[PDB]
Structures are given as structure tokens and as C-alpha cells.
Design a protein around this ligand. Structure first.
Ligand code: MG
Ligand code: ZN
Ligand code: ZN
Ligand code: ZN
Lengths: 52, 427, 115, 258, 46, 67, 49, 34, 240, 192, 49
RNA sequence: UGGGUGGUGGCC
């Protein structure tokens, strides 16, 4: 899976502008661990943007 | 007076404590010799001429407050507290976080706690000057109000100010160091630092190795999380994974990684991971008088009560914690904190002083426009209405213990199992 | 770990109605307005304005839990006056009051800035 | 059954605080205004930091936290910028954020004070409060230590975080004399007179008023410097009125759909 | 692959390869600290 | 370790008063007069300067890890 | 040679003896450290009386 | 000469001198040196 | 020796027969929460999202269980395993193929713990019968067990750092056995001394003594504000 | 739910002002303590002149201690009763005691009037040293302040010797707490 | 430990100025662990010749 | 690579 193991930037929503690394993903959404907080959240793949 | 005058110049004069012992002014006394001496608690009182009690004194105590240990000499007004409270404070005085050593950024210690903004007490004892407490403090002076606000702080619980915490109040960072070296169990058993692959490595977990670089060591500044590879380590038989994982529910950041050699010349590395701990709910806070408690809820600034001026308490503690434990020293410290803050000088709470009492502090507080007993009129934070009872409020030294809730939460549902008796493991 | 994100206090998510109305059945002409993502800042003024209306027989608000952001306002009026129109009249009165207040404050600021 | 007519009197106005008085109003409205001063007044503050190099003795998160608390002059931009959760732009655009740059290196022997004057922004209308008495200290650097970073400032209000609170201290007080007896003094004579007390030195409190209501709410709103102290009050009233308008719109929609 | 390190005391950027005795090419100091990462780090100022 | 940017309780800006406070202290000024010479009125702000210990100066003595 | 005796910090026979605080800071050992503990395999051990 | 009723100031000078000469862990260092 | 393996405490009989370590358990600090009924316990999301409860699929609940299976294991109100009636179990944490997400009537769903579930909640020094009551779950944001204050007196809890265990019954019969026997409201009166074990304490007691004095008068606004908090109120305002 | 929300209007607290007497009860307490000291001195004097008739079934030392303890307990009870009589209707200790929420009248007495007399093993402070309790005292002294009678109150602070005797009295509670847990669990285990 | 004896645990009169009357663990080792007072000093010994 | 031993500490 391409999305697994990628540094991603959230493109829209309240979490817009934040960064993280995708841990697990599906055909609909994905799980991103935030670099700034001690928590892993779930975000939609459409609002995602791979950086680097 | 000559001895004192020479002592006051001891950086110019070579006159020191040894020269004081030499002149036969002080005399070391052990217990058996103590059995036969006559001791005077203080000269200017117990040696004047009255109806002769003993009139045969052979020694005199230097200062009565010198009989307390290191930990119990930081309690302010300890002679005003119930006896077990001092013991509890001494117990919990060794678990408060603070700058534990000046050069803490070099040492690769395990489980290092350090607080962002430690402060010296607004009301100290003369004894903690020689403990260097005013250089490595542990705690923050906080505006504490003793009132039942919402019922969220009843059974030894406290309410904290969310806005104050957002402003860094009691924020702390938590270090943790890892160690791993490669040792030769045999010519056929050799361990190396090397990034495992999905092609040749047989035994592996569900943690990918992209975080670490080709060296097998994760570089500093890389976000980590539970069950993530840290030191890529393989063994030879062919190649099985022996890599170390950051333990579950840590989610820190690799602070620094040092690489060196042991006596045998093997490669060696210690990795430090840092984590910031905001004072969330369930954390343990304690006063200097054995008043331990856990946060019950965090209200924002506009929800807390306020005075005529916009002063909102940082912590609110229940009134029911005082009467049973009779920690009147806590109340006296809170009352004198107001005087110290307004007057601008650091108050003194040496145990047996006799120059400081409640009446003097009350008059000094009245000389600044506050109620002489330290009470204030608060307004309700939600409806803005006055409160029919005046609330006792003032600065107080609190200290945040190391028993964080995030280190104690734990749950299980069909996890690992023992080998001898197939029951769940422990820990 | 279990810390909620900071914006849960004031942001509505998908499918969350801002205000919901349910007819109370115990007594006639009573309704329960459940407003999401609000706090005392709004409920207190709404309730206070509702008490000035002489056609209202009951008006109070409560927050079921400080860790959840929603308040319930209960209104009971006389038979010839629906609670909903009382609520909307209170809203209009509050808005008019605030507009007048800001206008007079601007006038006072202009007066002060030029002696 | 209708809202009464409040009046405003301003007794003192500087560029740090405003001291006014409000007449003929219910206590709940006054308290809610006091509340909106604290929480729901939008303001600009930096909320996104990327650190390139940090040789200082303070870890990166500590630097970011200290940076976030620096007040920024947002007087005419706060009402023009859109909330980042609402801007349809990709990543960050000048319409919804401001970019800051910091690059300080200590090569001289003496210590180097990294202050807010070293924060360089691309928007002249949004700068930290050192426009024209030292600056906010961030770190101190020894020889050989450097700190390079890049930050973004966006729009928020105090209900989200305390770095978006615009007011330093808001003082609120009604009925300086205890005429309404909301508070009950055990021994009245022990209590100092209030600042706004219209009472002679003999008596301690006003005689009881059986039929009275809270009026004449005194205020003293002090700004942390990011907004002019009157702009705080104006923005608070505007925000409260807008919140009520939105509630009314949703209420009408729900009523006409039942 | 070069795996640049930093000496413990002289702080001189020196390169060491895999399976090589850890030593600063000068001053013989045996403590090496890894350099900071290159991937992006983003901290919110809350 | 270093002076907080903002007063914890009220929110006043205090992180710029530290150097001025020290300078006033290196004169005839007492703390009770130095504090309100700086405009610190509420005791919540006063205690922020009054009871703060500055460990950054000691930390600056150790040689940096890099050069 | 007979053996190696572990040395207790800030003793007469420890390298951190008589040094000025400036030297201690230059050696990455703060002057506030009391000493009085042994270092065994990199762990600080204290002898309880 | 006698030190009357200013003894509070003089009482802690000897304590300060004592802790300047002998540290807080002097017993350990003395025992190991011996 | 063999005798040492089962001699005394931590032996066979006393360490692995009369006492074991069980699955489906949780433990966290406790903090007060005066807004929960005395038979409620507030659990955090991370604990709730980790402890499952098997549920039998049924035409009356197949749709909701299907939606939960669709949600998965990441999103909280989801499932963790789906068990076929033949004994085989399909994991849900490893992005399974959409064919396996289909569930029949006789299947089992290992869903997460939602509101209304029944748990056992004890404090380790288990002295008497009233230290092992059962509560109803209510999920709340932060990471701590929240319980009402009138319930502290039986448990002898103190909110000063104490911790309590949480056991989740894993079968319908066990759930009905707990609900009908050891709910908190059924344990108000102890059989030890035929008197209540739960009473009004702390601020509530002090303020109810102050509240019922002869000279406590309330205007209509405060009376409405107080009546807003009566759950059993009949909506009639008494004559003043 | 109802009471915790009316409390927001009423409020409740505790402070230094709730632990103060009217400076006229202080004189009464001081007079009571002075009279108690005089009475124990008189008993001691009558004892050393062999003018003490032994109490039925008690030795001379036993009856001496009995009169001493009776006088001290009378002093403590009288001072406590005066302190209770002194409290106002707005005091917070009284409000939290009369409702039974926390504390008891003895706590009020110890905070305001007098801490009382310390004991170990049900007896006054033993002669740990040779025929005296502390080096600061004199041999064969059976007076009140030399055997653990704390004259002051928690508000007024404790003198050094009274502080040490209070610490001795406190240690017994910790020891009892340590042993009671170890015994009761075993008893219940055997019963079940 | 695990001894019902209380005499070794009690605070003796002789512990005045030598041992802290307050600081002590409250677990199973209450009274058996002690800390020196601030002025206390331990003798090092000398030859009696 | 797991077992074993000891110490410290938390709540009663
Ligand atoms: Mg407890
Ligand atoms: Zn934009
Ligand atoms: Zn080198
Ligand atoms: Zn302040």
C-alpha cells in the first residue's frame, strides 16, 4: 500500500495544516499519528496530502 | 559579639567554624554525654534571673528548629500541623518534580522528570537556605481558594484552571533512556545493528522500520509511538529480529542518540526519548502540609470565580480537607503568602520563631486593603452573582507529584499468556 | 491520550443540529430546547430575558455534564402563547439590546477621545 | 416583556485599559459580556511551528510553547482573516495565515538574547508587540548555538486556547455597597470600602433594600496589548450579537420544519 | 551510508563507516552523538 | 528555567519585565518598589517576578554539544 | 597490582577534589552535586548506614 | 560582649558557617577517606 | 522441589486455583463526578475501545451490528472480531476483504463497549459484600474512572490517588446475573447491621444542613433554576 | 444534584478567621491553664511530704498519676467547652461539625483552645533518659509540661519540647495502622 | 520486618537532635528507617593510645 | 532468550 508509511499533511478541516505519518489505511480513510500531540487519529483520505 | 563579627567577615578573614571549635565555644555532644548535661533551649530566655528552675546550665541549643531532617525542614510552620501530616509531607516531598540537577541535559538517566517553570516558595524557612532549595526548587506558587465550588473537588480532589495550564502552569517534560549493546553469545551467535528487511528476515512484528535510517539507529527529532522500532538489531543462526521497541503508550520524540564503545570494544548506544506532560485530569498534586489530591475537573478562566479585580484561583480545594487533619499551617502559609506578595518580600516560616504570629500578619494584610483574615468576596463564574459566603484565598506553594494517570491506565482483552500455566501474564 | 481535541467545545460536526425542540408531555405548553455546542454564556442571558416576559410561567437552563457541550432550556407559557414565539421574542429583544449597547458605546468612545 | 434601554458612561480610557459603567441592564447580560471579553474575541497568534535547527538548551516543544504566547498586533486583520478550518485554500495562504521567520546564531563570545525583535513577518500589519522597555525574551544562546525556525499565525479565540485570550485582567463588580445583601458579612466593620463606594466613612454598608435589582455594573477591561482596549468591547458585542443571530436563524429553520 | 557523527568533546564533524571502531579521527574521543534528522517536524504552539 | 511569557493566573504579559526588574534591583530599589515601578499591580503578577529563579544562566555555562 | 578499589565521588582520591566550580562546570559536573556515592557499571550506588 | 535580643541574626550566622565548612554529606566522605 | 511448587501462597491451589488473572479487566485512578447516578461509572474512551463484548447477531439487531462491523476497530463505536458459528473468527484490524464483512444470523460480533453496559467495579481490599458492586457504563472524554460520591463510602475510596478494577461480564446470563443481584441500588441496605451503607456526605451534607434552616428564602428565578435539576419533578411549581 | 447547585449561590469555605477567639475567651483559657498548673504543683507538693493517702486499690505512684491525669483532663475539657461556647453562628468549623460532614468538637478544641496531653501506651511520656524525658528538663520532674502536656493550640504553635512529644504521640497511630491491617485480613481469611 | 514488636519502631526520647522526628516511611518499614537531623555528625573513630 | 532474586514506592 502506497499510503502506509508516508508523511502526510492534512489539507482541510479543523486539523488543516497539521502533519503526521500514516500507520494504517483503507480504501476510504486512514490513521495518522500526529507529530505534535500524543495521540493517533483517523482522517479521510480526500483531505490528505503526502509531503516529502 | 567578637566571634559573630569575625564570622560575618569569613570571606575576608580565614575565621571559620573550625576556628570556632578551636576557641572552645561549641562542643560536640553525643548521646551518652547528653545524658548528663543541662540544656538550655535558648539563651536570651532560659538563662535570665527568675525563680531558679535549675540555674546550672552547662550547654545551650544553637537553634531548636535544627532537629528536623532534610525533607521536614522545608515544611513551613510545621509546629502548627498535626504530627502525621509532617510525616506524609516528608514522604511526598521526595516525589515532587523539579529540576533534579543543574546539568540534567547531559546525563542519560532513566525516568527523568523535570518541570518547566519551577519557583522558590513565597514563604520559606531559614533552614532551606543551606539545602540550596532556592536554586533547584520543586513546585509553583499558585493562587489557591478553599471553597466548595461545583462538587468536583470534594473527597480530596482539586479543581485546576484550564487557562492557567494552557499558559504553562505545572507543565512538565518526561525523559526516558534506552540501552542496547551487541554481545557475542558465541561464534555462531553474533548480534549486529542493521535495518531488517521484509525479504530475508523471518521473525518480525507489525512495526515497520522506515523511521530508522540505514545505520539501524533512529535519528534525533523523529516522532515515535508505541510498538515502534528503535534500534534495528538482528541475530545470526538465518537472521532473526532482536530489535528493541519503544514500550506501549509512550509516544515521545527521540531527544539525542549517543554512540560509543564499552570495555570489550563492542558498539554501544543509549537513546533518550522525551515526552511533554500537560497536567491533565487525574494527576496528583500536593501541598507542603500532607494535603495530597487529584485533579477533578479543569474549568476555563471565565468559569472560575473572580474577585473585585479579575483574579481567578488556580486551584480550588475542598473546605472539608482542613478540619479533620488540622493542618492550620496550610492556612497560615496561605494567609502570609498574600502579605509576602503584596509587600514584595519573601516571608519567613522558621518552625520556632516567636516573632511571627497570626495577629501581626493580619495587621500587615489589613495595611494593604484586604480583609484582615485573608477572606475575599468572589463572584460566581457562571451567573456573575455574588457568593453569600466570603472565600479564603491566597498564594500557596503546591508541588506536582510524579504519579501521573497516563502511567497507570491499563486494560486487557485476550492478550499474551504465560507458558507454565496458561493464564494471562502480570504487569 | 484520552484528551479531547480543543475545538469540540464550539464546533458542530456532521449531522449535529444546532437546536432541537421536543414537546414536554407532563404539563401543557412546555418545550425543551436542546442547543448543541453552547455554554452558560448564551443560556444565562436567554433565561434571564425569558423571565421578563409576563406570559412565561417557567424558564430555566441546565448543563447535564460539564464534559459535554449542550444545554437544555425549558419554557412553559400561558395557553394563548406558544413557548417557541416566546423564545424567538427573547432572542430579538437581546439582539436589539446588544445593538443599542454597542451604538451608545461607540458614541461614548467618540466623546471621550475628543474631550 | 421587552428589553430595556441600557446606557454607557466611560470614566477612564488609555491604550492599556478601559473603565466604563453600564446602567439599566440585567445581571446576566453584564456577566455574559464580561465572559465574551475573556473567551470569544478573535485574535491572531502563532499556532504552527517548524524547527530546522535548535542548539539551545531548551527543547523544541518548549520553544514552540513560548513562541505561541507572544502577543501579535491584530487590529484590522482579525476581522479580515478567515478561520483556517473555513478557508478553502490549499495549505496556507495570506488570506488565512501570516508567516514568521526566525534565524539567530551566536558567534560572539557574550550571550545572545533572542527576543521578539528577531521575529520577522511578511505582513506589516501583524507584528509582535514591539512596534515602537525590552522585548519578550525567548531564549539565550551561547557561542556556537543557533536557532532557526518558521512559524505561522492564525485566527482563534480564547474558548479554544489561552494564547488567544486578548484581555489581561477583566474587573467586574456590581453594587459596591452591600445594599442588596447578596453577600452577608458576619462582622461588617472589618471590611474595606469598595473602590466605587458612595458611602461616608461612618457606616459599613448601605441599609437593606427590600425591592432592588443589580444595576450599574462597573467594568475595567485591561488589554494585553494585542487589541486596543475599546476594540475588545466592540468585538465582544459584535460576536455576542452574531451568535444570537445564528441561533435565531437555526431556531426559525427548526420551527418551520416541525 | 556515511553516517555523519559529532564528537563528544571537540564536536568536529567526522565520518565513520559501518563495522569500524568508534573513534574521532582526531583527539581520540570515543563518544559520538548523532546529528539531527532531516525529515520535517511540526509543533503546534498549544 | 526562564521567565514565563505570561502571568499564569490573569494573563498579563510579564516576560519582558525580568531584565528591567534586575536592573532596578541593582540600585536603591526594593522589591516592593521595583515591582510597582514596572506596573505590576495585582499580587498574582507580583509573585510571578518575585518568586522566579533563573536557571538558564547556570545552564549557559556548560559547553554546547556542537561547535 | 592487586585490584581496583571503587572511589566515592568528591573524596580526597577522586578527580573532583579541590576543583573550582568553574572547572566543574567545564567538566559537565554541576557544583551542587553532593557526591558521596559510588559509580558501579554506570549506576550511582549509595551505602546506607 | 553579650549578644542580647539581636540573637536571632547571630544564631543563623554560625549555622551558615557550619554548613560552609562541613557539607551535608560530610559523614560519608569522612568515613570513606578514613 | 515439587512440594514448593504448591506449598503455600503463590502455589498451585492458592495462587492459580482460588485466584487467577483474568482477561477483560481495567484499572485506573478514580475522580469524583457528582453528575452521575449512583449506579453509573464513567469509563474513558481508550479503555472502552479496548474491551469487547460478544453479541449474538439477530434479525432485530443485524443492521446495527453490520454498521459497527463496517466502522471497524479504529473508529471507537466499532467491533474487533467477527466470529462465525463454526468457531472461526475473522479479525478486523487487518483490513479484511469485503466478502468477510458479510455476517449471517448465527454469527458473533466482538463489539466495543458502548453506553449502558454492565460492569463489576471493586476496590482491592475487598472486605465485605458492598465492595464488589455492579455499575452501568457511561463513556466520558478524559482518562479516569468517574463515580458518584455517595458510592465512595462502601468502597472506602478517597480520590487521593486510589485505583479500582473493572470487570466486564462476557455473557448474557452473567450480565443478567449481575444486573439482578449486585447493582448499586440493590445494595443500599447491608445485611450486616440492617442499615444503609450509602449516605449523603461532604459538601452535599453541609449544604443540605444549611439549606433546610428556618430562614432560607429563594426567589422565583433560583427556584426555577433548582427545579431544572429534579429528574422526578412533575412540572408543577408549588405555591410559595 | 439540587444541593450542589444551590451551593453555588450559597458558597462554603474555611479560613484563619474561623479559628480565632474573641480575645476574651483567650483570657479564660489562660486562667484555666494556670489553675491546672497550680493544682498539679499542689498535688506534687503534697506528694513529696508523704501527705498523699493512697487511693483504694492503687499504689502511691498510681494514685498520684490518677489525680494528675484527672486534673489535666478537667482542664482540657473545660477549655474545649469554653472554646465551643465562644464560636459564632457564622463560623465554618461549627457548621461542618454540627452537620457531621467532617471533624468533631475535639478537633475544634484542639485547634482553638489547647492541644492536650500526649501519651504512649496509655501513659504519659516515659523517662527515656535517666530520670527525665529530655535533656532540657531536670531529674525527677513529674510536672505537666515535663511529661507531655501540650499547653498551646494548633493555631498558636507548639514549643520545641511539646512538638517532640506530639511527634512521639503521633508515631503510635502509624504503628497501630501498620499492624491492624496485617492482623484483620488473616482473621477474616480464617473465618471465611 | 513482619515483626509485631513495637519497641524498635517507637520514637525514643534519645532521638532528639540526632534523627528527624517526622521523616519516616509509612509502609511495612515504619520506624525502622531513619534520617539524620541537619546538625548530626557521625564519629569516625581514633586510636585511644 | 526466559526464569530467579532483591530493592524502592502507591492505596488501604
Ligand atoms: Mg487514599
Ligand atoms: Zn487560506
Ligand atoms: Zn573529537
Ligand atoms: Zn497576573
Amino acid at each position: 500500500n502506497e499510503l502506509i508509511g508516508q508523511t502526510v499533511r492534512i489539507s482541510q478541516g479543523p486539523y488543516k495544516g497539521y502533519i503526521g505519518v500514516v500507520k494504517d489505511a483503507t480504501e476510504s480513510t486512514a490513521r495518522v499519528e500526529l507529530h505534535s500531540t500524543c495521540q493517533t487519529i483517523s482522517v479521510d483520505r480526500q483531505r490528505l496530502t503526502t509531503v516529502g | 559579639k567578637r566571634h559573630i563579627d569575625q564570622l560575618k567577615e569569613r570571606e575576608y578573614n580565614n575565621y571559620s567554624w573550625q576556628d570556632l571549635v578551636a576557641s572552645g565555644v561549641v562542643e560536640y555532644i553525643d548521646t551518652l554525654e547528653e545524658e548528663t548535661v543541662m540544656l538550655a533551649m535558648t539563651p536570651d530566655d532560659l538563662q535570665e534571673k527568675e525563680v531558679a528552675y535549675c540555674s546550672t546550665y552547662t550547654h545551650c541549643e544553637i537553634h531548636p528548629s535544627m532537629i528536623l531532617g532534610v525533607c521536614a525542614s522545608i515544611i513551613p510552620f510545621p509546629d502548627h500541623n498535626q504530627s502525621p501530616r509532617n510525616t506524609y509531607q516528608s514522604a511526598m516531598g521526595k516525589q515532587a518534580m523539579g529540576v533534579y540537577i543543574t546539568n540534567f541535559h547531559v546525563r542519560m538517566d532513566t525516568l527523568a522528570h523535570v518541570l518547566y517553570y519551577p519557583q522558590k516558595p513565597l514563604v520559606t524557612t531559614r533552614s532551606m537556605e543551606y539545602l540550596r532549595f532556592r536554586e533547584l526548587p520543586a513546585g509553583i506558587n499558585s493562587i489557591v481558594a478553599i471553597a466548595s465550588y461545583t462538587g468536583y473537588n470534594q473527597e480530596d480532589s482539586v479543581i485546576m484552571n484550564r487557562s492557567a495550564v494552557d499558559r504553562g502552569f505545572f507543565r512538565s517534560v518526561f525523559y526516558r533512556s534506552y540501552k542496547e549493546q551487541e554481545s557475542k553469545k558465541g561464534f555462531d551467535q553474533e548480534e549486529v545493528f542493521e535495518k531488517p528487511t521484509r525479504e530475508t528476515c523471518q521473525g518480525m512484528r507489525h512495526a515497520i522500520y522506515d523511521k530508522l535510517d540505514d545505520d539501524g539507529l533512529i535519528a534525533p527529532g523523529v516522532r515515535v509511538s508505541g510498538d515502534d522500532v528503535i534500534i534495528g538489531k538482528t541475530v545470526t543462526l538465518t537472521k532473526r529480529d532482536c530489535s528493541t521497541f519503544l514500550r506501549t503508550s509512550e509516544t515521545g520524540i527521540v531527544d539525542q542518540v549517543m554512540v560509543t564503545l564499552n570495555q570489550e570494544g563492542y558498539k554501544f548506544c543509549k537513546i533518550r526519548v522525551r515526552s511533554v506532560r500537560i497536567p491533565q485530569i487525574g494527576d496528583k498534586f500536593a501541598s507542603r502540609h500532607g494535603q495530597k489530591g487529584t485533579c477533578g475537573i479543569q474549568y476555563r478562566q471565565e468559569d472560575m470565580p473572580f474577585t473585585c479585580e479579575g483574579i481567578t484561583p488556580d486551584i480550588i480545594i475542598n473546605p472539608h480537607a482542613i478540619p479533620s487533619r488540622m493542618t492550620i499551617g496550610h492556612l497560615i502559609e496561605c494567609l502570609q503568602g498574600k502579605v509576602s506578595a503584596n509587600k514584595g518580600e519573601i516571608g519567613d516560616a522558621t518552625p520556632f520563631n516567636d516573632a511571627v504570629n497570626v495577629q501581626k500578619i493580619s495587621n500587615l494584610l489589613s495595611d494593604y486593603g484586604y480583609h484582615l483574615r485573608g477572606n475575599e468576596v468572589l463572584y460566581n463564574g457562571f451567573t456573575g452573582r455574588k457568593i453569600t459566603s466570603q472565600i479564603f484565598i491566597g498564594p500557596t506553594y503546591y508541588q506536582r507529584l510524579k504519579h501521573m494517570v497516563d502511567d497507570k491506565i491499563h486494560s486487557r482483552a485476550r492478550g499474551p499468556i504465560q507458558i507454565l500455566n496458561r493464564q494471562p501474564m502480570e504487569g | 491520550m484520552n484528551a479531547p481535541p480543543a475545538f469540540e467545545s464550539f464546533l458542530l460536526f456532521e449531522g449535529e443540529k444546532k437546536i432541537t425542540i421536543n414537546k414536554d408531555t407532563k404539563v401543557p405548553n412546555a418545550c425543551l430546547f436542546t442547543i448543541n455546542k453552547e455554554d452558560h454564556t448564551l443560556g444565562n442571558i436567554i433565561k434571564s430575558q425569558l423571565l421578563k416576559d409576563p406570559q412565561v410561567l417557567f424558564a430555566g437552563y441546565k448543563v447535564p455534564h460539564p464534559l459535554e457541550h449542550k444545554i437544555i432550556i425549558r419554557v412553559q407559557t400561558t395557553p394563548d402563547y406558544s413557548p417557541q414565539e416566546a423564545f424567538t421574542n427573547a432572542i430579538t429583544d437581546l439582539i436589539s439590546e446588544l445593538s443599542l449597547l454597542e451604538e451608545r458605546f461607540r458614541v461614548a468612545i467618540k466623546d471621550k477621545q475628543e474631550g | 416583556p421587552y428589553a430595556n434601554q441600557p446606557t454607557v458612561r466611560i470614566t477612564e480610557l488609555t491604550d492599556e485599559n478601559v473603565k466604563f459603567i453600564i446602567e439599566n441592564t440585567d445581571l446576566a447580560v453584564a456577566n455574559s459580556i464580561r465572559r465574551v471579553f475573556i473567551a470569544e474575541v478573535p485574535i491572531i497568534a502563532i499556532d504552527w511551528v517548524q524547527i530546522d535547527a535548535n542548539s539551545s538548551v531548551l527543547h523544541d516543544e518548549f520553544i514552540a510553547h513560548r513562541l505561541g504566547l507572544i502577543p501579535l498586533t491584530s487590529d484590522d486583520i482579525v476581522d479580515k482573516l478567515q478561520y483556517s478550518r473555513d478557508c478553502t485554500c490549499e495549505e496556507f495562504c495570506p488570506e488565512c495565515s501570516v508567516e514568521f521567520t526566525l534565524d539567530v546564531r551566536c558567534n560572539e563570545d557574550q550571550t545572545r538574547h533572542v527576543t521578539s525583535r528577531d521575529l520577522i513577518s511578511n505582513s506589516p500589519r501583524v507584528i509582535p508587540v514591539t512596534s515602537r522597555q525590552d522585548d519578550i525574551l525567548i531564549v539565550k544562546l551561547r557561542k556556537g548555538q543557533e536557532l532557526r525556525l518558521r512559524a505561522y499565525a492564525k485566527k482563534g479565540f480564547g474558548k479554544e486556547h489561552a494564547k488567544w485570550n486578548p484581555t489581561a485582567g477583566v474587573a467586574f463588580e456590581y453594587d459596591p455597597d452591600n445594599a442588596l445583601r447578596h453577600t452577608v458579612y458576619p462582622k461588617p466593620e472589618e471590611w474595606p470600602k469598595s473602590e466605587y463606594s458612595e458611602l461616608d466613612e461612618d457606616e459599613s454598608q448601605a441599609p437593606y433594600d427590600p425591592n432592588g435589582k443589580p444595576e450599574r455594573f462597573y467594568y475595567n477591561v485591561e488589554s494585553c496589548g494585542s487589541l486596543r482596549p475599546e476594540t475588545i468591547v466592540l468585538s465582544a458585542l459584535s460576536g455576542l450579537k452574531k451568535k444570537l443571530s445564528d441561533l435565531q436563524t437555526q431556531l426559525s429553520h427548526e420551527i418551520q420544519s416541525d | 551510508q556515511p553516517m555523519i557523527y559529532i564528537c563528544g568533546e571537540c564536536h568536529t564533524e567526522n565520518e565513520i563507516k559501518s563495522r569500524d571502531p568508534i573513534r574521532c579521527r582526531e583527539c581520540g574521543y570515543r563518544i559520538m552523538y548523532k546529528k539531527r534528522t532531516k525529515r520535517l517536524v511540526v509543533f503546534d504552539a498549544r | 528555567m526562564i521567565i514565563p511569557v505570561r502571568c499564569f493566573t490573569c494573563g498579563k504579559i510579564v516576560g519582558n519585565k525580568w531584565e528591567a526588574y534586575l536592573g532596578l534591583l541593582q540600585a536603591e530599589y526594593t522589591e516592593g518598589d521595583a515591582l510597582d515601578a514596572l506596573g505590576l499591580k495585582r499580587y498574582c503578577c507580583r509573585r510571578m517576578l518575585l518568586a522566579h529563579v533563573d536557571l538558564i544562566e547556570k545552564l549557559l555555562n556548560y559547553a554546547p554539544l556542537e561547535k | 597490582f592487586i585490584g581496583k578499589i571503587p572511589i566515592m565521588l568528591r573524596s580526597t582520591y577522586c578527580l573532583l577534589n579541590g576543583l573550582t566550580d568553574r572547572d566543574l562546570c567545564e567538566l559537565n559536573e554541576c557544583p551542587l552535586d553532593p557526591g558521596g556515592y559510588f559509580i558501579i557499571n554506570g549506576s550511582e550506588k549509595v551505602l546506607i548506614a | 560582649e553579650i549578644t542580647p535580643d539581636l540573637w536571632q541574626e547571630a544564631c543563623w550566622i554560625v549555622i551558615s558557617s557550619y554548613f560552609d565548612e562541613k557539607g551535608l554529606v560530610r559523614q560519608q566522605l569522612d568515613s570513606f577517606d578514613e | 522441589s515439587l512440594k514448593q511448587r504448591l506449598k503455600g501462597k503463590e502455589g498451585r491451589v492458592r495462587g492459580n486455583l482460588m485466584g487467577k488473572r483474568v482477561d477483560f479487566s481495567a484499572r485506573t485512578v478514580i475522580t469524583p463526578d457528582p453528575n452521575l447516578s449512583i449506579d453509573q461509572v464513567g469509563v474513558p474512551r481508550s479503555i472502552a475501545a479496548n474491551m469487547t463484548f460478544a453479541e449474538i447477531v439477530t434479525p432485530f439487531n443485524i443492521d446495527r451490528l453490520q454498521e459497527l462491523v463496517r466502522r471497524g476497530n479504529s473508529q471507537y463505536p466499532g467491533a474487533k472480531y467477527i466470529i462465525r458459528d463454526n468457531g472461526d473468527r475473522i479479525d478486523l484490524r487487518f483490513h479484511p476483504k469485503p466478502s468477510d464483512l458479510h455476517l449471517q444470523t448465527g454469527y458473533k460480533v466482538e463489539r466495543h463497549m458502548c453506553d449502558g453496559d454492565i460492569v463489576i467495579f471493586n476496590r482491592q481490599p475487598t472486605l465485605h459484600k458492598m465492595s464488589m458492586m455492579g455499575h452501568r457504563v457511561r463513556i466520558l472524554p478524559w482518562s479516569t474512572f468517574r463515580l458518584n460520591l455517595s458510592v465512595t463510602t462502601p468502597y472506602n475510596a478517597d480520590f487521593d490517588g486510589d485505583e479500582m478494577n473493572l470487570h466486564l461480564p462476557q455473557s448474557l446470563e452473567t450480565r443478567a446475573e449481575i444486573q439482578e443481584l449486585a447493582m448499586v441500588p440493590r445494595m443500599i441496605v447491608t445485611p450486616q447491621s440492617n442499615r444503609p451503607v450509602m449516605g449523603i456526605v461532604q459538601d452535599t451534607l453541609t449544604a443540605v444542613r444549611k439549606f433546610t434552616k428556618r430562614d432560607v428564602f429563594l426567589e422565583r428565578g433560583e427556584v426555577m433554576n433548582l427545579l431544572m435539576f429534579l429528574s422526578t419533578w412533575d412540572g408543577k411549581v408549588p405555591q410559595p | 444534584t439540587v444541593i450542589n447547585n444551590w451551593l453555588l449561590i450559597e458558597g462554603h469555605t474555611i479560613g484563619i478567621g474561623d479559628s480565632i477567639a474573641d480575645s476574651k475567651t483567650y483570657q479564660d483559657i489562660q486562667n484555666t491553664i494556670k489553675k491546672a498548673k497550680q493544682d498539679v504543683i499542689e498535688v506534687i507538693e503534697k506528694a513529696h511530704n508523704n501527705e498523699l493517702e493512697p487511693t483504694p486499690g492503687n499504689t502511691l505512684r498510681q494514685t498520684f498519676e490518677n489525680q494528675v491525669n484527672r486534673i489535666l483532663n478537667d482542664a482540657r475539657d473545660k477549655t474545649g467547652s469554653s472554646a465551643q461556647k465562644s464560636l459564632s453562628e457564622y463560623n465554618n468549623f461549627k457548621s461542618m461539625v454540627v452537620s457531621g460532614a467532617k471533624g468533631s468538637k475535639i478537633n475544634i478544641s484542639q485547634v482553638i483552645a489547647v492541644v492536650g496531653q500526649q501519651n504512649v501506651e496509655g501513659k504519659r511520656i516515659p523517662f527515656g533518659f535517666k530520670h527525665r524525658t529530655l535533656p532540657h528538663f531536670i531529674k525527677d520532674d513529674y510536672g505537666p509540661e515535663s511529661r507531655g502536656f501540650v499547653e498551646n493550640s494548633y493555631l498558636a504553635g507548639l514549643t520545641p519540647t511539646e512538638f517532640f512529644f506530639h511527634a512521639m504521640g503521633g508515631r503510635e497511630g502509624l504503628i497501630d495502622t501498620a499492624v491492624k491491617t496485617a492482623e484483620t485480613g488473616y482473621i477474616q481469611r480464617r473465618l471465611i | 520486618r513482619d515483626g509485631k514488636l513495637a519497641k524498635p519502631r517507637q520514637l525514643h526520647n534519645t532521638l532528639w537532635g540526632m534523627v528527624c522526628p517526622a521523616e519516616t516511611p509509612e509502609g511495612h518499614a515504619v520506624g525502622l528507617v531513619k534520617n539524620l537531623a541537619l546538625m548530626a555528625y557521625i564519629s569516625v573513630g581514633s586510636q585511644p593510645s
